[PDB]
Design a protein around this ligand. Structure first.
Ligand SMILES: N[C@@H](CCC(=O)N[C@@H](CS)C(=O)NCC(=O)O)C(=O)O
Ligand SMILES: N[C@@H](CCC(=O)N[C@@H](CS)C(=O)NCC(=O)O)C(=O)O
Lengths: 218, 217
């Protein structure tokens, strides 16, 4: 009965969507843009997307949602079998989220929505991203996947964060992070050949006009 | 065996320290300040503190270290047994980290280290902290603990984040967040009565001059 609330232009939503698809699980998509409206905050407490509705109620936060799905659902494992290896996947997932996705996100207004961001914000984003990509290069195994030889949750955070982060680099900061990170470049192409990727990208394109109208409205 | 790398002034280090003490676990403390030095990056890949050393190698990131401890170690459980309840604890912990601790942290230079922060950063922190405290109010159960009737990992993130965020509020932003959040004020006093808190605070005070000296040079 799992329901995934969010929208197909959301990168964090697509991470959960890809996990569900990779694991062959049944789910219903519900269009939800989150935000600060009182009715939105009742679904998602900080107004963030995605949210997973279960028999027990709503769960928000991609990393938390993925762990819940891994614990409770069947289908292909997206973690290794040993505790320390599981924690390494989660370490890499958290590094990409905190030190690549979130800093890149501070510039998405400029890179994607045509609205310049403050110089101080770009300065901090540049430093944080340089440090984030350096952490990933140092800690990632890329064998070929982020954590080693098998697809794991960390690869979902990677493939839907590093693409946008690189676009922010080239468009906003004059830096092509992937140009000198061939391990990462190879993985991004490899994740692009995932059999569920065409579905993800098709749904994203199909959903883009409504999302942009939502933007221009508020 | 377990070694905990970091320093007792670090709030993230203290969260893991408290989890280990609360679980009755043996561990060794190793003074480590992280940073961008090559030798430090070998231990902690983003240069952050704390890091746990296990028989298998180093793990960084407090939330990750706490989960690893819960999954592998003996002692008092700091999560409920049911998987949805565990996820709700982790949601609350993540929300405190991302929406309270990290925005507050953008202002620590001023609140703690005598270095004034830019207005743009102060105004962002104000709006983020107001929202993060609202999220915690609406999602937390405070019964009396963050997630319900029992102490969990989310209370560790809470008791070592919300103290500092309130200090930022009063000193930097002219807002006392806890003044209108009685369930949180009450929880913070309860956590302060934990039998391991005096050791944590004494170690912090003892470690302060060396930390400040590292900062100066
Ligand atoms: N910490 C959240 C962040 C997710 C997030 O920032 N989602 C974006 C869409 S990709 C969002 O909810 N934006 C709408 C808003 O912030 O109001 C998570 O990990 O799931
Ligand atoms: N995401 C990290 C945050 C750790 C963190 O910011 N620790 C601080 C000390 S409390 C630190 O390593 N600061 C020194 C530095 O950034 O170089 C975690 O969750 O453990």
């Amino acid at each position: 009965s799992l329901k995934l609330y969010g929208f197909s232009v959301s990168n964090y939503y697509n991470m959960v969507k890809l996990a569900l698809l990779e694991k062959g699980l049944t789910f219903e998509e519900v269009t939800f843009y989150g935000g600060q409206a009182p009715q939105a905050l009742e679904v998602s407490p900080r107004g963030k997307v995605p949210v997973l509705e279960t028999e027990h109620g709503f769960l928000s936060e991609t990393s938390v949602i993925l762990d819940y799905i891994e614990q409770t659902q069947g289908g292909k494992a997206l973690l290794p079998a040993d505790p320390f290896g599981q924690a390494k996947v989660r370490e890499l997932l958290k590094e990409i989220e905190l030190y690549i996705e979130l800093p890149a996100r501070t510039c998405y207004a400029e890179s994607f929505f045509g609205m310049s961001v403050e110089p101080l914000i770009k300065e901090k984003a540049r430093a944080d991203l340089l440090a984030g990509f350096a952490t990933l290069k140092r800690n990632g195994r890329f064998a070929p996947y982020v954590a080693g030889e098998q697809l794991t949750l960390a690869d979902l955070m990677f493939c839907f964060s590093v693409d946008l982060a690189n676009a922010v680099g080239k468009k906003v900061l004059n830096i092509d992070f992937l140009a000198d990170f061939p391990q990462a470049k190879a993985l991004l192409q490899l994740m692009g050949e995932n059999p569920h990727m065409p579905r993800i990208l098709a749904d994203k394109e199909a959903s883009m006009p409504a999302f942009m109208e939502m933007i221009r409205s508020g």
